[PDB]
Amino acid sequence: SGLEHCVKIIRQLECSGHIDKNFAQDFLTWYSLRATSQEIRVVKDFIDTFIDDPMALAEQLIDTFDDRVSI
């Protein structure tokens, strides 16, 4: 599922150190509970587009979603 895939990549980014623990946890909480269906589609598109570049993915996820994710 979309969530399983999202968790796998987010854990990878955290383990690689491209995102921190707090962002990883906030992001997954947000993605699974608060993200609209349209936002979920955007996350999936980001993940697909940046598949070859985890650092770029991380930076884009932070830039785009940090405000919505962190509270």
Numbering used by the authors: 620 to 690
Sentences from the paper on this structure:
The Arabidopsis VEL proteins are accessory proteins that interact with PRC2 to nucleate and propagate silencing at the FLOWERING LOCUS C (FLC) locus, enabling early flowering in spring. Here, we report that VEL proteins contain a domain related to an atypical four-helix bundle that engages in spontaneous concentration-dependent head-to-tail polymerization to assemble dynamic biomolecular condensates. The VEL domain adopts a compact globular fold, consisting of four α-helices in a quasi-antiparallel “up-down-up-down” configuration, each of which contributes to the hydrophobic core, as illustrated by VEL1VEL. Mutations blocking polymerization of this VEL domain prevent Polycomb silencing at FLC.
We conclude that the VEL head and tail surfaces are defined largely by three key residues, an isoleucine (VIN3I575 or VEL1I664) and two basic residues (VIN3R554,R556 or VEL1R643,K645), that engage in close hydrophobic or electrostatic interactions, respectively, with partner residues from the apposing complementary surface. The equivalent double mutation of VEL1VEL (RK>AD) also essentially blocks polymerization. Importantly, the RK>AD mutant never forms floaters nor fibers.
